[PDB]
Structure formats: C-alpha cells, structure tokens
Amino acid sequence: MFEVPITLTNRKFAQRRKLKYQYINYISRRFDRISKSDEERKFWKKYEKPEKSFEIWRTVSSQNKQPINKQKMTYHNFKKIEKIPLRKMEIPLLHCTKENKLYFQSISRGLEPLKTSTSEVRNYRTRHIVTLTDLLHLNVSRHNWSLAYKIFATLIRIPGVQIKSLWGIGVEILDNLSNSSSGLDFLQWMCQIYSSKSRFVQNINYRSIVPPFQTGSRTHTAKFAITYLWSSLINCQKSMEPTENDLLQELIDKISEWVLTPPFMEDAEVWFIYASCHLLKADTLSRQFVNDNKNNDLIGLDRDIKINQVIKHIHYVRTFLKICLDKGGFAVPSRLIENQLKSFESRLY
Amino acid sequence: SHTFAAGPSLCCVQIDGKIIGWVSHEQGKIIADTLRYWKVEGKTPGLPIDLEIGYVPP
C-alpha cells in the first residue's frame, strides 16, 4: 500500500502520459480558440513548474481578481470543444495497446483508475521491495523497533532506494532505536549525500523524484538538512545547564560554513534556527553566571568580563532575528522572543 | 570646546589623536600618575591595563 522506492516500471505509464497530455493540449487549444513527449513538456511550459514546497499555496488574500466566468458550460458547449480533439486522439490511440485504448477512453470520460500501477508490476526485485516498504511502515505504526530497522537495513541493500523513505524512516527508526545511532549521523551523512548545491528545477519530466523531500542545493531547501540542524540544537539542549563539549559551537561553525549560497542564500529557519542556537548559547552563559547574582554573593571576580561577552551576543542575536524578519521570514513571533530576551536581560542585571 | 586655550604653555590631553582637553602641566603629572594607578588597579573598567599613557612633561 505505501510509497515505493523505485523508478516506475517505465513502459505503459510513459505512453498513457503521451495520450493524456496530447488530449489536454488538443482540448485546451480549442478552449483557447473559443475564448479568443514534447506535448508533455509543453503542458508544463503552459503551467510552469512546482516551487520548492508542495502545493502552490500562497495566501488567499490580496488580489480579488473577479471570476464569475458565467459558469459558461452548456453541455452543448463542452461537446463543441470535445468533438474534434477525441478524433485526433484516435490516430495515436490505434498505435497504442488495447489496455491503453480503454485507459484513455476511461480518463477521457472522467473515470479514474482504481488500478494502482504499483499493484501489477511483477518484477522479482520490485516484487519484494513493495513487501518490505509496507512491512516497515506497518512496523513503525506499532513502534516495533527491533524488527522495523531489520526491514529498513535490508530495504537499502536492495538496489531500489532513492533517499526517499530512507531519510524519512531512517531518522525516526534511529530515534525509536534506543540503541545505536543518532539520526544526526545519518542526518549529517544525508546532508553530504544531497547538498545539490546546484539550482536545478523545472525543465524535464521529474517523474522519478518529485518530492520536495529529496533535492535542493540550488534554492529549494532540503528538509533533511533543516531537520539535521533542528535535531542538532535539540541534541545540544539535553543535559546542558540542567573541552569535550564543543557541539553548540560545532553547530555555530557548521552553519557558518554556509552563510548563504542556497541556505543562507534563501532565508528563514536557516537564519532563525541559527539565532535560536545562538539564543540558547546566551542563556547557558547567564546560568553559568546567573543564580543569585552570577553564582552567588556578587562577582568582585574582575568586574564582569562575562556580562560583556553575553551583551555582545544578545546584541548579535537581535541582528540575526531582525535580518530573518526583514528578508520576508514569516516563521518568527517576534513579540515573544523580544519579551523573553529582555526578561532574561533582567537576570543578567 | 570649553577650554578654548592652547599652547605648549598648557598640557593637552589627547586620545588616539582626538584632543579631548587641557590641563596644567602639574595636572598633567597628577593625571599621568593617578591614571597609571587606576590602570594597574582593577577598578576602572573604562581603563584597560594595556592603555599606553604618553606623558611628555614640559
């Protein structure tokens, strides 16, 4: 039942997509006229590519560009547009297999296929892989840690894994695996596995990797690289302030290497997550110099070199939170962080 | 701005080539010595141990 690790047996699906598009450019062309392989690339050039996310969700409040289009659909008017594209789909419909003739005659009637293409492929290698992908998803849906990674560990040794669920079940399985590994390692191995510092979107028929859940290093954030930083700050928090340390610095220098290109380059949590790691580094230093005036009765301890190191940092953080707002970052509820930071300043006094 | 006097007849206090004020040469020496005292001390946070205090007496 679940999402499979592999390029989709490219055989009938590629010619079903010819007939689908070729009809859509034919029927649409005559809608454009009434208003007054390559076809598939032209269909996407007529509706653009998919930004770095999922569904071109964007507000729902700005432009009230009125659509009352007058329903404009008189059964009689639809069959005027349709009567000629269907006879031009029969030319290519004849050269197509008997299975693809009716598949086209089903989708051109508006029927949808209850025939999951991944419910017929009969290829040994593929065969199993569907069993393993479903096995591991039914095992994390009951938290079976000792069996879920056995299935996970075998699923990647078989030639059919594109990061895919490997990066999305390979991390939790390591959070649920109380034993060996911190999705982190696996997360940092992924980051190096798919930097994709190259800005590639659009162009060709992404039909092998179409999930904003692997890819990027162009603009479109990688979400395993954002999860690597988020899991890393949460891995820094646990049992700090409750020279072998370094981690909150390691994370300050592992974003420093970035400082925009693709990540710096693109805004948000990149900036925000960085400030948040930085804000935590300011609190720890107020604790390590907090309780009952620093530790206790005063400091005499050479004025307060430690207050100046912290005020520099508080002033720096406020710069990172501000540039993350300015550059269009909707992520941060500024009111709460500023109140927290000022009430914390009041601990440093 | 307030001294409004200038000459080798008067001590000029300058910081990094920013002339900030004037005093008597006697106060020149008083300042040089009391300043060095607050430098070796730890009580003048506006006063880093490593400030170099050029006194040139008359």
Side-chain angles (χ1 to χ4, degrees):
Chain A
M1 70 186 192
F2 295 90
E3 182 167 3
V4 132
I6 325 171
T7 56
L8 318 313
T9 328
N10 50 254
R11 181 62 201 148
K12 57 188 147 174
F13 311 125
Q15 84 184 125
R16 289 179 187 176
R17 287 185 74 99
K18 285 199 287 270
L19 300 173
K20 188 178 192 182
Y21 282 146
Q22 202 190 348
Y23 182 60
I24 289 285
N25 178 77
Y26 285 8
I27 279 264
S28 69
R29 259 159 89 209
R30 187 161 282 252
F31 179 86
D32 310 354
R33 215 80 94 183
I34 277 322
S35 280
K36 284 185 63 173
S37 49
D38 320 311
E39 207 122 352
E40 171 162 21
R41 295 179 183 175
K42 188 179 180 178
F43 170 77
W44 290 111
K45 187 176 178 177
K46 213 192 151 167
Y47 286 95
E48 228 46 29
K49 284 280 46 113
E51 309 117 26
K52 272 301 140 202
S53 65
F54 233 11
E55 343 294 357
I56 311 179
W57 267 358
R58 41 227 262 317
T59 78
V60 182
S61 277
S62 159
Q63 29 46 236
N64 55 351
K65 61 180 180 295
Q66 230 359 63
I68 287 177
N69 32 95
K70 302 301 290 187
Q71 110 247 276
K72 293 179 179 179
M73 289 295 187
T74 165
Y75 175 92
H76 274 21
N77 203 46
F78 185 70
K79 73 180 178 175
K80 287 165 200 166
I81 303 162
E82 177 207 43
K83 158 171 274 194
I84 161 278
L86 288 176
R87 299 196 235 164
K88 300 203 308 162
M89 273 306 92
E90 190 89 49
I91 282 214
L93 249 195
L94 137 137
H95 287 303
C96 99
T97 69
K98 297 180 180 179
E99 184 213 280
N100 293 323
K101 293 181 174 176
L102 62 80
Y103 176 96
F104 177 75
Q105 293 164 347
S106 295
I107 72 168
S108 75
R109 281 180 177 99
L111 312 180
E112 261 182 307
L114 60 80
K115 185 180 68 65
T116 102
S117 203
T118 301
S119 29
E120 39 35 275
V121 183
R122 298 296 299 278
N123 247 28
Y124 226 143
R125 62 180 295 275
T126 323
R127 65 180 295 275
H128 283 341
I129 292 166
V130 177
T131 306
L132 296 176
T133 48
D134 284 348
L135 269 191
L136 65 66
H137 288 297
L138 291 174
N139 286 332
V140 302
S141 79
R142 288 187 302 272
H143 305 287
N144 295 61
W145 63 102
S146 70
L147 292 171
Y149 63 89
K150 288 183 179 75
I151 301 294
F152 177 84
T154 64
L155 183 65
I156 187 166
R157 300 293 187 187
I158 309 175
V161 164
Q162 30 286 294
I163 84 313
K164 262 6 286 7
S165 61
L166 297 173
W167 96 262
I169 314 297
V171 304
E172 181 272 334
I173 192 50
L174 293 179
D175 204 48
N176 185 42
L177 186 137
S178 56
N179 209 279
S180 163
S181 322
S182 88
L184 308 155
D185 5 344
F186 181 93
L187 276 164
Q188 92 110 298
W189 181 88
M190 270 283 165
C191 285
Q192 243 86 240
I193 170 47
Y194 307 167
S195 143
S196 83
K197 267 175 200 199
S198 58
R199 72 171 65 199
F200 81 94
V201 206
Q202 319 209 32
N203 301 304
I204 208 178
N205 258 20
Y206 299 25
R207 180 189 296 241
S208 24
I209 159 186
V210 274
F213 278 41
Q214 283 107 243
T215 174
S217 179
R218 62 180 295 275
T219 151
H220 183 197
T221 324
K223 198 68 184 179
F224 57 85
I226 298 307
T227 295
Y228 170 50
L229 275 52
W230 280 110
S231 297
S232 178
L233 103 81
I234 296 299
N235 201 62
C236 298
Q237 179 182 0
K238 60 183 181 193
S239 199
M240 295 200 197
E241 71 165 309
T243 302
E244 80 301 335
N245 185 272
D246 205 318
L247 269 70
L248 38 58
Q249 305 299 75
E250 186 222 9
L251 187 58
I252 225 168
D253 286 357
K254 286 211 67 52
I255 81 82
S256 274
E257 285 166 319
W258 311 58
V259 194
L260 188 147
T261 280
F264 296 95
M265 294 300 293
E266 203 256 347
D267 184 1
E269 40 159 47
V270 254
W271 257 195
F272 172 45
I273 164 123
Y274 171 49
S276 303
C277 304
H278 194 49
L279 168 61
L280 178 66
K281 183 65 182 185
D283 208 347
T284 300
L285 288 187
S286 178
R287 189 61 61 182
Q288 251 56 337
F289 182 92
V290 267
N291 52 121
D292 176 76
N293 193 31
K294 339 110 32 260
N295 264 2
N296 38 203
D297 247 301
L298 319 110
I299 159 236
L301 321 207
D302 182 24
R303 40 163 346 278
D304 229 321
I305 67 85
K306 55 192 190 303
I307 291 179
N308 189 18
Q309 181 175 3
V310 174
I311 291 175
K312 165 186 53 46
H313 170 309
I314 290 170
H315 173 72
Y316 201 32
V317 80
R318 285 185 295 98
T319 304
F320 304 145
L321 179 61
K322 194 189 64 68
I323 65 185
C324 189
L325 285 164
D326 307 306
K327 297 174 55 45
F330 318 70
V332 277
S334 62
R335 182 64 67 199
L336 180 58
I337 302 163
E338 185 180 40
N339 288 334
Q340 288 163 324
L341 181 153
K342 186 178 179 181
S343 300
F344 167 78
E345 191 161 344
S346 303
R347 300 177 180 163
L348 191 70
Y349 300 140
Chain B
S1 64
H2 306 304
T3 292
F4 179 75
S9 68
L10 293 174
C11 184
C12 188
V13 195
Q14 316 190 334
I15 176 63
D16 212 353
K18 184 186 165 62
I19 166 166
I20 60 121
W22 299 91
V23 293
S24 64
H25 291 314
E26 283 193 351
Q27 200 57 36
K29 194 187 186 179
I30 297 166
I31 302 183
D33 183 76
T34 54
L35 207 60
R36 203 171 292 277
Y37 175 82
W38 302 118
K39 191 167 74 177
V40 186
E41 180 60 24
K43 306 176 185 172
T44 61
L47 204 180
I49 195 68
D50 55 353
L51 197 68
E52 174 168 31
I53 300 170
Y55 182 56
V56 179

